[PDB]
Design a protein around this ligand. Structure first.
Ligand SMILES: *[C@@H]1O[C@H](CO)[C@@H](O[C@@H]2O[C@H](CO)[C@@H](O)[C@H](O)[C@H]2NC(C)=O)[C@H](O)[C@H]1NC(C)=O
Ligand SMILES: *[C@@H]1O[C@H](CO)[C@@H](O)[C@H](O)[C@H]1NC(C)=O
Ligand SMILES: *[C@@H]1O[C@H](CO)[C@@H](O)[C@H](O)[C@H]1NC(C)=O
Ligand SMILES: *[C@@H]1O[C@H](CO)[C@@H](O)[C@H](O)[C@H]1NC(C)=O
Ligand SMILES: *[C@@H]1O[C@H](CO)[C@@H](O)[C@H](O)[C@H]1NC(C)=O
Ligand SMILES: *[C@@H]1O[C@H](CO)[C@@H](O)[C@H](O)[C@H]1NC(C)=O
Ligand SMILES: *[C@@H]1O[C@H](CO)[C@@H](O)[C@H](O)[C@H]1NC(C)=O
Ligand SMILES: *[C@@H]1O[C@H](CO)[C@@H](O)[C@H](O)[C@H]1NC(C)=O
Ligand SMILES: *[C@@H]1O[C@H](CO)[C@@H](O)[C@H](O)[C@H]1NC(C)=O
Lengths: 262, 291, 97
């Protein structure tokens, strides 16, 4: 059940400076200047500022279109994942990305639309817990046309305070059925708003699903001591990708030194 | 080609060679041998375990095995003599090894040998019409082996059923588990047995003493479906030995070329397999097997 | 040719090579009946594992559809200016000037 109070606010805009830079492919280039055309996030663009606090909890559904830029600033790892698909329901094949703290779950099945798809954590008090309890993301899975399971891991769900120590910036797109995952995770120190720095994303994996994704969601984590759940202080970023050309500078090793939007 | 002096006459197109230096051609060293380096043959889909699985679903109840994101090597199963018969439709068994498939559905079931001959595109009979029908464009193959020492036992094996009666003929790739009683005449049935009301499903008698044509055979039908989605399951990639510091024709993953391979002090990013120069011509690669 | 070459349900006088170990060169007639050997198992002239009998027949029936109706195909080949042409149509020659 969607939280009773929350808040209703217009989509306030922010400007991402160097965000949107990634290696277009697995080609290695060093000490050279390469220029290619692809779907990119232009520099100094006006992105929408998304956030989660103890009384707003803004998690709108946005269209994916050609491509969308993802960025997040984390402490307690409030981001539970992303839900992908056309109608985001069992009417079509929907892609699921969620971290259960055990195995990364990537599955394409028939999903029952979750109005408020999150994972709650209860009974902190003494023995502070911070462990998963119920899965509200999807009610059931049916025709699982695709499934993927990664290796086991351990995620820290304990809440943190102070500056944001984690920065997750992702770039997803779809080209001829190929779904590219561009993942970069770097530590930062930030109070509010957005961190200022250059980042070069690297491709993680590819998902040759071959479906059209017209909408996407951003999973979040809630905790309380489904209308009574609260949330920590965190913010993530969303922006639209455009077919732009960049000039990528390369060092000896191969790491991008700087990028120039044409 | 007799002498280098004669190469001057042929390049200048004159029988008289004037005094001076002339470039008559440009030599190039041809590759000595072809180098093939492919990724590890592991992380397959276990077709040998499903083909060799103890028990199967009924021909109408057949289990749909979804095969995606793996490699399918069909040369090992064909050359291992693990099957009774081998048959394909439209594609040779060697061509399947060089092709990538979007989605593959393994059809497992056990029927008698007299009913195996009805498996083919757009055919008729008991199993084709009333159980499982093959489309005309079906590109897969038919593989069966003799299970009479496994799936049959003394006293009969009633686990494997089939659909004897249906009011019509099934479409290709149509699985119908409906137990509704077939009404032969005008006598009402409504799921109640009686005159002209007969239970359609029937259980195969299976014992080790059955005749060859009546012996139970495990049949695995491989459904090869090429959709608009990118291809996932690909044929086997068999890597060969690696040669360095020589002129060779190399094919690495989906990249081909000719040159001299030398290990340098350069370091690629772990997510970047191939390097290139200013001209986007590959100056270095990473081996698909060894790092 | 369905009005002629079609005989009963099939005609075995018209055969073809279904299988071959490689691609035959153009303008080549291969009469070899040898069994195709895919693997290392010796065929010795019989069918079996990795052994298939390449010689097959086209089914010819007068009641078959237009897809199975045999079409006699005569490929016309020629050489250009490689020799004096002794085949020329009834075009009357003229005087020389
Ligand atoms: C390529 O990356 C390597 C590893 O990070 C660099 O080597 C290190 O560079 C740092 C720079 O502060 C030094 O402090 C380390 O002592 C170096 N380690 C070794 C063992 O060399 C390398 O300099 C980078 N090269 C370039 C030009 O980017
Ligand atoms: C959220 O609100 C919608 C109506 O706007 C309601 O249908 C839904 O049931 C509410 N939450 C849940 C998860 O039930
Ligand atoms: C970006 O959005 C902010 C907030 O709406 C606005 O004040 C600013 O003028 C915008 N800048 C551009 C380039 O449109
Ligand atoms: C998440 O992990 C819990 C605890 O191990 C387990 O009970 C649950 O089934 C998992 N859920 C998912 C979606 O993997
Ligand atoms: C603390 O919580 C953990 C996880 O729920 C539980 O396993 C453990 O028994 C609890 N310990 C105490 C002292 O309550
Ligand atoms: C999913 O499977 C069920 C049962 O096989 C089938 O009825 C349904 O049509 C399938 N999904 C779609 C979208 O058809
Ligand atoms: C995706 O959209 C394209 C272009 O409109 C259309 O051709 C195709 O059928 C769509 N595919 C899916 C899976 O919806
Ligand atoms: C099945 O596996 C067993 C154990 O490896 C083996 O002995 C048997 O021959 C196999 N049968 C076939 C034909 O796959
Ligand atoms: C692949 O197989 C080889 C066999 O020697 C092994 O050494 C290697 O670790 C395996 N994994 C990789 C990296 O391909």
């Amino acid at each position: 059940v969607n939280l009773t109070t929350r808040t209703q606010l217009p989509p306030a805009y922010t400007n991402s400076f160097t965000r949107g830079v990634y290696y277009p492919d697995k080609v290695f280039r060093s000490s050279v200047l390469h220029s290619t055309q692809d779907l990119f996030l232009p520099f100094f663009s006006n992105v929408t500022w998304f956030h989660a606090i103890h009384k707003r909890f803004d998690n709108p559904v946005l269209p994916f279109n050609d491509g969308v830029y993802f960025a997040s600033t984390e402490k307690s790892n409030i981001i539970r994942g992303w839900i992908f698909g056309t109608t985001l329901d069992s009417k079509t094949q929907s892609l699921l990305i969620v971290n259960n703290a055990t195995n990364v779950v990537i599955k394409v099945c028939e999903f029952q639309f979750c109005n408020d798809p999150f994972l709650g954590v209860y009974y902190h008090k003494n023995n502070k817990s911070w462990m998963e309890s119920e899965f509200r993301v999807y009610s059931s899975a049916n025709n699982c046309t695709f499934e993927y399971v990664s290796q086991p891991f351990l995620m820290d769900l304990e809440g943190k305070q102070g500056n944001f120590k984690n920065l997750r910036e992702f770039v997803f797109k779809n080209i001829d059925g190929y779904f590219k995952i561009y993942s970069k995770h770097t530590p930062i120190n930030l109070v509010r708003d957005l961190p200022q720095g250059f980042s070069a994303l690297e491709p993680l994996v590819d998902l040759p699903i071959g479906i059209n994704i017209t909408r996407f969601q951003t999973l979040l984590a809630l905790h309380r001591s489904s209308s009574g759940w609260t949330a920590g202080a965190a913010a993530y970023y969303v922006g639209y990708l455009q077919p732009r050309t960049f000039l990528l500078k390369y060092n000896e090793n191969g790491t991008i030194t700087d990028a120039v939007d044409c | 080609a007799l002498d280098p002096l004669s190469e001057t006459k042929c390049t200048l197109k004159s029988f008289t060679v004037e005094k001076g230096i002339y470039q008559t051609s440009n030599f190039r060293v041809q590759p000595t041998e072809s180098i093939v380096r492919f990724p590890n043959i592991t992380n397959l889909c276990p077709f040998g375990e499903v083909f060799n699985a103890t028990r199967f679903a009924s021909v109408y109840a057949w289990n749909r095995k979804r095969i995606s994101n793996c490699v399918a090597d069909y040369s090992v199963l064909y050359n291992s003599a693990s099957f009774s018969t081998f048959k394909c439709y439209g594609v040779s068994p060697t061509k399947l090894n060089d092709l990538c498939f979007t989605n593959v559905y393994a059809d497992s079931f056990v029927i008698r040998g007299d009913e195996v001959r009805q498996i083919a595109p757009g055919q008729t009979g008991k199993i084709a019409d009333y159980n499982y029908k093959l489309p005309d464009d079906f590109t897969g193959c038919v593989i069966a082996w003799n299970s009479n020492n496994l799936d049959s036992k003394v006293g009969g094996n009633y686990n494997y059923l089939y659909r004897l009666f249906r009011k019509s003929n099934l479409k290709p790739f149509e699985r119908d588990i409906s137990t509704e009683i077939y009404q032969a005449g005008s006598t009402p049935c409504n799921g109640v047995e009686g005159f002209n009301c007969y239970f359609p499903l029937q259980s195969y008698g299976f014992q080790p003493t059955n005749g060859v044509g009546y012996q139970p055979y495990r049949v695995v039908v491989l459904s090869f479906e090429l959709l608009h989605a990118p291809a996932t399951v690909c044929g086997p990639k068999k890597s060969t030995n690696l040669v360095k510091n020589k002129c060779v024709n190399f094919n690495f993953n989906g990249l081909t070329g000719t040159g001299v391979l030398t290990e340098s002090n350069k370091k690629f990013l772990p997510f970047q397999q191939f390097g290139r120069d200013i001209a986007d011509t590959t100056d270095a690669v990473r081996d698909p097997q060894t790092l």
